[PDB]
Design a protein around this nucleic acid. Sequence first.
RNA 1: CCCCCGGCGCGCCGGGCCCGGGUCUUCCCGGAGUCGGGUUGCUUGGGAAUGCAGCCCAAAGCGGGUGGUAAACUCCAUCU
RNA 2: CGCGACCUCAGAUCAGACGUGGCGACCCGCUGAAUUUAAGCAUAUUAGUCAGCGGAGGAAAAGAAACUAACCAGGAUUCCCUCAGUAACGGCGAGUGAACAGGGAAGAGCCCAGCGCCGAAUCCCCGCCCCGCGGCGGGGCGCGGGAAAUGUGGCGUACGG
Lengths: 51, 203, 137, 210
Amino acid sequence: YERRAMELLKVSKDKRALKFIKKRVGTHIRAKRKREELSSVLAAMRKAAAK
Amino acid sequence: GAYKYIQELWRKKQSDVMRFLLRVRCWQYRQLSALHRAPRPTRPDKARRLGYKAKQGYVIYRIRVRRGGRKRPVPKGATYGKPVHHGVNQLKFARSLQSVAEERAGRHCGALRVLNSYWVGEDSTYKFFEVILIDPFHKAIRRNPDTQWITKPVHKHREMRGLTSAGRKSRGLGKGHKFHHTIGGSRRAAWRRRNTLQLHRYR
Amino acid sequence: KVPPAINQFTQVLDRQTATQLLKLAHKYRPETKQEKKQRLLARAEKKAAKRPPVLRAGVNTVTTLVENKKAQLVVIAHDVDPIELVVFLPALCRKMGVPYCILKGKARLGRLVHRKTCTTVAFTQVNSEDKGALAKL
Amino acid sequence: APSRNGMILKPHFHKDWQRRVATWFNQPARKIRRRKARQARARRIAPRPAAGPIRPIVRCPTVRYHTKVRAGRGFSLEELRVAGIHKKVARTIGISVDPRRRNKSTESLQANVQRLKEYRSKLVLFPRKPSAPKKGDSSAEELKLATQLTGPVMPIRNVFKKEKARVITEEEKNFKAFASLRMARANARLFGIRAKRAKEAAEQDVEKKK
RNA sequence: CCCCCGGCGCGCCGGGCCCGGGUCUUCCCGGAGUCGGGUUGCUUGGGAAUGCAGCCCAAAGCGGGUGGUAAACUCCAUCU
RNA sequence: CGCGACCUCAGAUCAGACGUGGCGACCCGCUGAAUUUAAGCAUAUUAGUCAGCGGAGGAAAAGAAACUAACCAGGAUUCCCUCAGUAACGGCGAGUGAACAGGGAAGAGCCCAGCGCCGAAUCCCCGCCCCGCGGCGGGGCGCGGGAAAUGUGGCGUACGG
């Protein structure tokens, strides 16, 4: 479900991605907490792709 | 050591390394018998956290427990009563399947004494656990002062009174406002003390 | 499709270099119950009138000193029943820059010590003559 | 069917209460056994007090009793850490400890360490071995003055301060106590909406200029 | 008056026994198909679900649980 | 193909141990009704109650907070008094129905895994010595056998270490 979520991150459908994880992991605070972590590793993938 | 490295791995059940290795043992146990002995713990980090000490006298049994819920044993429904008690199909059991797993091993292996069990694999039709038994009459267990509490006769058949971690979960006892209906010793004890009349001497 | 973090355990070291490394490891074997007994009678007799570098068996000994970067070579067994006990360690020494080799069979690896099985053996330090013997390995 | 007038009774006697009637004929017999065991516990640790270890001064919650003082369960560590006595030593000489307690105030903390200093003054310590007086022991002449203390040792008393007669000031005559209450009852209740209405003033100011 | 029985210390020996507190510097520290969410059934005084379980989803770490009206944000308190 | 480990898994009238079963007044885990009441009755009540099932002990269970509170805060459990027939539940009908605070009786706290540190520094059994031996125990001697590195013993548990 996380690899399905990063596709929503690269198309940046964040309002739908949060709803996607909330129906997966549970309450809003957990779905919030995981969400910024997953764009932080995409940016950690985006920092290596350039150089 | 390396146990903490194993600890955070087993919390990654959805990962491909675990999704593979879980389905191997789940396939492997499903070809075995319903009740048999394993030589060594397949899940060692969860063993020692529950009290498993690798020495002579610690024997573990890996069993399979049928998935699902419980249905009421009555012919064609046969609940000659009110519409409240006609419910026969969607009923659920009180004790957890992990506590039923410690029963079937403890009852059959009545020579040993149950300590703890843990999850090792799941299927749509079965539910596998590895219970950690203990031998009450080996001197390696008898002579260590930390584990001679097992041999006392009140620790016979902890799986029949529910004194295990799986056993303490299903009784619903604990501290707080949420467990008011079991203040005292038991859910039977709370109800008993709440429904007697204290006929004093001078009233 | 075996996942590659455990597929890496059929990708094992060859025949002839396993001979030399165990020959290199047939020189740092641990003190037995006798070689401890013949150690303690030697230190107790000097009571009336420093240790050489030895190996480390078991993952609980190894994974500590790799984090302290004290190891110079790691020997691995490939056929543990809970493969999860080893799976992290090749991907760990890569991040720790510690050279690791995998060996087929834990029993022949279990006879470096006088026990049945050994999952992991470490080379933390060596003798003075045994320096070019590992630097080529 | 009720009579002309009465009350409405809901007597919870619809179960089978007859089977679960616990009568109290043990009470004169229970007090016999209890005091006998209370005397056996007395003579078993005879020089130590029958009341057991000391209980600290404790305030009680739930504002109906928040002006009262109880007997505590045990002295907190921050009550004993500044006392100069380690927690695994105070159990040997009759000081009850429980580590879960806090001291958010200071006046209770200082009053209890006052109670331990005077308890340490009263404490007649035997030697470990009869032939040698150790450094922290009591002297020999105090051993004859060592007997059993009945009753709770250093009993907690909810005493109060006397207030001398004083002349009333002029501000106190102009002091409107009840009018201060309803003004303060407004201030505590309408604190949120006054915090909110203070925020939109700024945005309706900045768009006027910008 | 006579046995039995333990208790209590007192002396002999085989013994294992080197352990504490305070200042400062610097490292370490926690339990997972479980918490939790969904839904169904039972139970509870527990009432937009107290407790128990079955099934699906499935954790996090200045996090988590609780703070008796659902939810969002904001502070706290409070345990682990 | 011979051999040697190991890994699994059998089989013994193998060496030595251990479990069944009875009582069940009191205790613990499940299961679990209906007569009864509501002037009928189906929710409810009866009631987590009898009948059934398991396993105990001379006590059991529970128990050292993922606690109560909202204070100037208390501080494991169990038991009595009070809270109180109260908050609350309920064809809001019938009925049902706790907890905190306070006063008592009692009073008691601690071990692991993990974390690392100790050269596995630990343990069973057989051979032997002494000493007691109707609780087969201690001490020492055995390149005696074995367990254990897929982790024993020591240090150490949230009050910090």
